[PDB]
Design a protein around this ligand. Structure first.
Ligand SMILES: [Mg+2]
Lengths: 196, 196, 196, 196
């Protein structure tokens, strides 16, 4: 067992680092199962040469909508749950993380099947905020996934290995994903199938 | 489908922007139905030439009150729910947003009908906080709606259109509202009517 | 109806203000009923000549305790609820506010009667944080109430009046309290009495 | 009864203090019972010569995991509850505090017995954030506990005494722990045993 973090709070990541450069999100999001739940996931990278303090991730679904009364809200925003209720949206971001949105009854993907996904006109905006530890300054980084950038039935390739007491990141694999056996039903349909 | 936000996090809003100027709230609030719920709504504008980081909206009802014991609290404040429990009060404010307060059993408007509204001596204070992305500094903008500035049975005119790959804002329409068919009952009365 | 706050966000408080000076808490806390609930209350003042942005109030009970297993924690701290769950701990602090802690089943005062109060060895630490609007800087102000500084059966004298379109504060009354008819039972005892 | 904190907000701790130096976490975490609950605890120290404003504690369990579907997440992070839901993670850090994680059904230690603990490949990362009151700057301090640094059946030795109106800290005892009678069952097993 080789420490991620030393008792003195130094991280055993990126040997020879010195902990302006910009934060990377994965080009694609993926949907697939984790412990029996359908989840939407995307990857967020760290800053090789600074800690980000009070780092937090949020995500908005951007989607035009009509209310039952006929009000048309172009580009309507709604907050997509990525750990808000348990503090898991507060990141310890010292190597890349896969951020997971569990597609449950409160999720806007609840009723979206694999066939249905491509027909949807929607966009996920991902927003990381924090304080660059050196800089002193609050920062925000953003990205976006439209429908065609969400891969149904895929997982992220892992980036992290241990070399000589220090965890290292294959940034070559950062955006890489692979196919895995995944149902094609919506989360709602899965839940209904499961409940008889 | 034309992106709101580019993979690199630049927003496709206000072509030729450069992302001190001051934030605008709509002159009026409106009350009307959205998906079968009575909602109080107001509009908050963006800053044409800076992002606001960690932007959040709150609202206080200011209303003198007497407790059942006879204590008189002049200008008593109470927090009006505008997305606190789901993180929807954390704004991605890159074009104007309609902020919605659903008038449910916990709302101070729960028992206020259309006829009753004008007889009420109350004020809504709206408070946007965040960090101007350039400036570096925390900012706060405020406004206020007294009873006569709340329009029962109205919606906001939409401001947003797509022109040549870029979303544009008709600021001429920012404060504009229009009439829509709306019950005159209080939310409480609506709920009671609905439950038989 | 004279506005607390103008559409442009200027506050109608302290005519001739210019919105380092220090924040005042009331010398005493009081306990008495509000709408059928026993509440512990204290007063927090505003800064005559700056807004405080992202202002928030918290309070800790400081009290030595022994666990059932016999562990002695000197000066053990626990968080006293002053609006955390509804966002009412986020203050719009432009004139003095009475901050209220409702003494319910989760409160550390739940079982404390009027006779019992003076026998208790406890201290309430009150902590206001925020950003002074000019200064630029985060600030914290603190105070403290020991047992003998908590007045059972009292309310705060009101400080606020309207003079010529502007709300004014009688700072002479800031610390002043008055006696009101109040049961001497603990909140727990009151609840039990009420439930038969 | 000698005040922890004076009415003017000065703390009666470290006589002759002047309220860069670095924050200390205890070398070890301990597990033992508090009021009938198994708790994981660690100690966090204060800064002798500055207040920390808006101080907050969080903790991540770092543990490689395989999902039921066979996805391997190396160094998977999950947030360990240390007061998030009651605001008790917001510290009034003016002398050392023992931070407590109650091992309940939602805890990742729920099923970990005393014999099982040493066989686990896990790490707890503890993260204190806040604003150094003078400095002006946001700070973060970190540390870490691997399995062998968690002492099952132990409590922290108390550090705090009153000398001449001022609370003083025996920093010699800061890391010191002592053995106490503690069941060897997992929290889950304890709960099951208790429920018949
Ligand atoms: Mg901040």
């Amino acid at each position: 067992i080789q420490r991620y973090v030393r008792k003195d709070g130094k991280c055993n990541v990126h040997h020879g680092n010195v902990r302006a450069e910009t934060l990377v999100f994965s080009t694609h999001a993926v949907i697939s199962m984790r412990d029996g739940k359908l989840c939407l996931m995307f990857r967020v990278g760290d800053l090789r040469n600074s800690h980000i303090v009070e780092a937090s991730i949020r995500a908005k679904l951007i989607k035009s909508k009509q209310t039952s009364e006929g009000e048309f809200i172009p580009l309507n925003q709604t907050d997509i749950n990525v750990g808000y209720y348990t503090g898991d949206d507060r990141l310890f971001l010292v190597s890349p993380l896969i951020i997971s949105h569990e597609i449950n009854q409160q999720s806007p993907f609840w009723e979206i099947s694999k066939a249905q996904l491509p027909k949807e006109e929607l966009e996920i905006v991902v927003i990381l905020e924090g304080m660059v530890e050196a800089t002193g300054m609050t920062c925000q980084a953003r990205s976006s996934y439209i429908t065609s950038e969400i891969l149904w039935g895929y997982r992220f390739t892992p980036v992290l290995t241990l070399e000589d007491g220090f965890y290292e990141v294959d940034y070559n694999s950062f955006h890489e994903t692979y196919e895995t056996s995944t149902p094609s039903l919506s989360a709602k349909e899965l839940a209904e199938l499961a409940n008889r």
